[PDB]
Design a binder for these strands. Structure first.
Ligand SMILES: [Mg+2]
Lengths: 130, 111, 119, 49, 246, 143
RNA sequence: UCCUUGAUGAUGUCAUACUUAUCCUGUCCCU
RNA sequence: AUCGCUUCUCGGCCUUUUGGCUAAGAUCAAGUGUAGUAUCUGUUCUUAUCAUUAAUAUCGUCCUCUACCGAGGACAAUAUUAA
């Protein structure tokens, strides 16, 4: 029995998120050795190419290969589409906005200036006192 | 290529100051910053100039100190411009030289 | 209090307000002209219309400011794409553009309201 | 290197409604700290004497 | 008869805000469900939408999202030659914007155009070669398509640039994923020759441990402790070599 | 009723129009029909609804009665009311008749009769047993 | 040899009250 | 312990969001009329959908063929018995 924990830190980079996404996708894939050793025996010496080998303009993927690629890419697109999970909308909070963009601007304002404007909120709720 | 004559002077100054700040914030951000956020800093520059004219102390509670120092720099530049223009126009209105009525009211409002 | 609520809700100038009405009227006149043209095509009458503008017909006629894709090192002349199935007996203007975000989030906040209020 | 949104005392282009604590987050007029001198005391006392 | 009397409710400002938001005096109704018949009306719809997007492109000019929305709309209707034109125009505007290359290549992958997408990846890694996103996705497309030798060649083109630690580990993991502990050993030799660091020799030695090559691992150890010298080394190298011989 | 979305009411043989009704909201009125009581009008507005306008001197549309179970994006159509004003039958592009309860204001019944879009629907004025429809497919049907 | 889903008198008419292609420039009442 | 589905909770992205300038750019209180339009209040009529079976046989439109006519095929309910 094995065990692994993989949380995430903050954003920091569009390349670190790429690399995390790549490690996920690249651990998920499983090779089939039959096609591999078939192509190995067929191609022989040129199966371990350098940068300048010759085979750049030759490969033609059979229908199952491109089907596997498109299925994988659709799964990847769906996992990317779930990137911002929608927080649930309670209506018990005293609303503070006259619009739909106004609400999101007030949310950004509470993100940035919520740590500082905490005494004045207490004054406004206790009756503009202290 | 329209010339900056007399009715375009202030608008062109504010058109060029804003471009200078655009260049400086594109060069000031480090290597892996998301390259948005120019509009927000320009709004802060506008607010620092309005607090300068209002003699209101301007202080944004969290703001990176290179951005805060750069906005203070360009606000001091526009302040020197505004004040030296007010000196020149007041000396003109005093000596009797030809001035517009609009620049008379503008000079009163600056003074 | 009524004027207070009406002036708190407002965020638009005169010009935005007239453009909103103009867009509504454009939608109305487009539906009316569509009704007339669909009736003419239904009964069968080939009345044509004019068009007087420089650009604008360049969009459906061909590709607007076409750049061919730069090509190289892999033969890309045989392969081609399969076009869209029409299905002109179920299809809606809403069906092509997809559900706009305010409808989906309205359905979601309705579901949230129900599951909060019943619990 | 994150930039906070500008909440202005003057301009409200899209006519939003901003909470009062946010709207009055002008800290400089709250930390301005009008501090009195100690030479008013000598003046007041000498004048009463 | 009106009665002055002190109340109970005492209306507040947040109640005014709640009642002002519910007036909805800017929320226009959605357009009516309009069923379109034969392709005259479909072309009229397309005319309206293309005019809207081309007008947004005229004003913004830059603003890369406008191009992306218009290209996604063209790919949704399987008119992907239009979208090839739109992405090529957008790359004429801004060729250094990496997600634009990504969306163009993922359209050509998604629509079963393996060969167009493959051309796009080749052009992408040519023009923006220090963007590692491009190389990962192109060597991953060549692995999902089954072109093993093609992914070998793209990895070799990528190792020509001397990228970073993670690129070489991804190439080694590719090799080890298939078979080929000898070729992964060659890539490990190149990697320790192009990134000399104590942690890299430790990782390569740990590799030779985990594939049971204790004589090879000891030769790596003897080649590492001699290469670093005498005056520089931190603990970790001799700690790992001590733990190995333990 | 006109292509421009307005109604013009007139006395007979006199050119001027006494009452003009327009609201920026209403999309159009391609077909309008008058109740057997002479009390209510029914327009099939393009906007996918039916509007009731009081026949009575006050030509003011009333909020209480509305109909929106059916879609005509932009089709001419006939709306009729079952004699006795019990029901309203709309014919639509999709081809399905929409029967509403006037009293209760709710789509009581619906048919997918016709395979092509259907226009005029008539309730036999004397017999309650049936209605007659027509539409593009070229057939007259009796329901 | 089909086909798809529900929110407690109503509806209509008459009367009363509130805003002009359309303009004029200000005062009451008790100790 | 592991994998998948569902309910609930939470963190991160959420500049995706306030897209110029000046003398805050300037200024700052009120009915006079009508008819016409809109809204509200009563005055009047709400609870349900309507109308035999089994067996047997066979004028109108459309298509094809032959010289308006004839033939063939298909579709549209009809007749009889019995409670
Ligand atoms: Mg205004």
């Amino acid at each position: 029995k094995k065990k692994r924990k993989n949380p995430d830190l903050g954003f920091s980079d569009y390349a670190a998120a790429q690399l995390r996404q790549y490690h996920r996708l690249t651990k998920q894939i499983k090779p089939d050795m039959e096609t591999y050793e078939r192509l190995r025996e067929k191609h022989g010496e040129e199966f371990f190419p350098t940068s300048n080998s010759l085979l750049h303009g030759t490969h033609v993927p059979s229908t199952e290969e491109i089907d596997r690629m498109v299925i994988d890419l659709e799964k990847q697109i769906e996992k990317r589409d779930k990137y911002s999970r929608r927080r649930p909308y309670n209506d018990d909070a005293d609303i503070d906005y006259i619009n739909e963009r106004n609400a999101k601007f007030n949310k950004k304002a509470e993100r940035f200036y919520g740590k500082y404007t905490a005494e004045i909120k207490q004054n406004l709720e206790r009756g503009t006192a202290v | 290529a329209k010339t900056v004559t007399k009715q375009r002077v202030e608008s062109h100054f504010d058109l060029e100051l804003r471009a200078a700040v655009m260049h400086d914030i594109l060069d000031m951000m480090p290597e892996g910053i998301k390259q948005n956020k120019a509009r927000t800093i320009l709004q802060h520059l506008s607010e620092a100039w309005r607090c300068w004219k209002a003699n209101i102390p301007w202080k944004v509670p969290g703001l990176p100190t290179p951005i805060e120092n750069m906005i203070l720099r360009y606000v001091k530049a526009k302040a020197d411009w505004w004040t030296n223009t007010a000196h020149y126009n007041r000396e003109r209105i005093r000596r009797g030289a030809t001035v517009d009525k609009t620049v008379c009211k503008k000079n009163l409002g600056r003074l | 209090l009524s004027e207070a609520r009406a002036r708190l809700a407002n965020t638009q100038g005169k010009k935005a307000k007239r453009k909103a009405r103009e867009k509504q009227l454009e939608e109305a006149r487009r539906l009316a002209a569509l009704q007339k043209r669909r009736e003419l095509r239904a009964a069968g009458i080939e009345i044509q219309k004019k068009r007087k503008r420089k650009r604008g017909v360049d969009y459906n006629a061909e590709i607007p400011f076409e750049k061919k894709p730069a090509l190289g090192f892999y033969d890309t002349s045989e392969e081609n794409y399969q076009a869209l199935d029409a299905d002109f007996r179920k299809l809606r203007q809403q069906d092509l553009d997809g559900e706009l975000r305010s409808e989906k989030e309205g359905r979601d906040r309705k579901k949230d309201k129900q599951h909060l209020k019943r619990k | 290197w994150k930039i906070p949104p500008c909440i202005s005392n003057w301009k409200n282009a899209k006519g939003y409604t901003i909470p009062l604590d946010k709207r009055l987050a002008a800290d400089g007029r709250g930390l301005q700290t009008v501090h009195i001198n100690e030479n008013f005391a000598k003046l007041a006392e000498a004048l009463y004497i | 008869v009106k009665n002055k009397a002190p109340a109970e409710v005492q209306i507040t400002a947040e109640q005014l805000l709640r009642e002002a938001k519910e007036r909805e005096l800017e929320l226009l109704p959605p357009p009516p469900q309009q069923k379109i018949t034969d392709e005259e009306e479909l072309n009229d719809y397309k005319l309206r939408k293309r005019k809207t997007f081309e007008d947004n492109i005229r004003k913004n000019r830059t603003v890369i999202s406008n191009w992306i929305k218009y290209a996604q709309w063209e790919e949704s209707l399987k008119e992907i030659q239009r979208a090839r034109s739109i992405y090529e125009r957008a790359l004429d505007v801004d060729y250094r914007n990496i997600t634009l290359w990504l969306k163009y290549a993922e359209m050509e992958m998604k629509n079963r155009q393996v060969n167009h997408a493959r051309n796009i990846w080749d052009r992408a890694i040519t023009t923006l070669p220090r963007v590692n996103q491009f190389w990962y996705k192109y060597t991953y497309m060549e692995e999902m398509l089954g072109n093993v030798a093609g992914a070998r060649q793209v990895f070799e083109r990528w190792m020509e640039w001397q990228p970073e630690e993670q690129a070489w580990h991804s190439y080694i993991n590719f090799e080890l994923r298939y078979k080929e502990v000898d070729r992964a050993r060659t890539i490990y030799e190149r990697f320790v020759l192009v990134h000399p660091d104590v942690k890299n020799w430790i990782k390569y030695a740990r590799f030779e441990e985990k594939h049971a090559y204790f004589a090879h691992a000891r030769k790596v150890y003897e080649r590492a402790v001699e290469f670093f010298g005498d005056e520089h080394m931190d603990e970790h190298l001799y700690v790992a070599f001590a733990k190995f011989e333990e | 009723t006109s292509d421009d979305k307005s109604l013009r009411v007139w006395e007979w043989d006199i050119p001027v129009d006494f009452k003009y009704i327009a609201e920026p909201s209403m999309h159009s009125m391609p077909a309008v029909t008058l109740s057997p009581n002479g009390k209510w009008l029914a327009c099939q507005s393009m906007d996918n609804q039916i509007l009731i306008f009081g026949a009575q001197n006050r030509f003011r549309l009333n909020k209480k009665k509305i109909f929106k179970g059916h879609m005509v994006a932009g089709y001419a159509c006939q709306v009729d009311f079952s004699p006795d004003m019990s029901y309203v039958i709309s014919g639509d592009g999709n081809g399905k008749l929409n029967i509403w309860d006037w009293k209760t204001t709710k789509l009581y019944s619906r048919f997918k009769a016709h395979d092509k879009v259907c226009i005029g629907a008539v309730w036999h004025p004397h017999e309650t047993s049936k209605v007659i429809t027509c539409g593009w497919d070229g057939l007259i049907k009796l329901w």
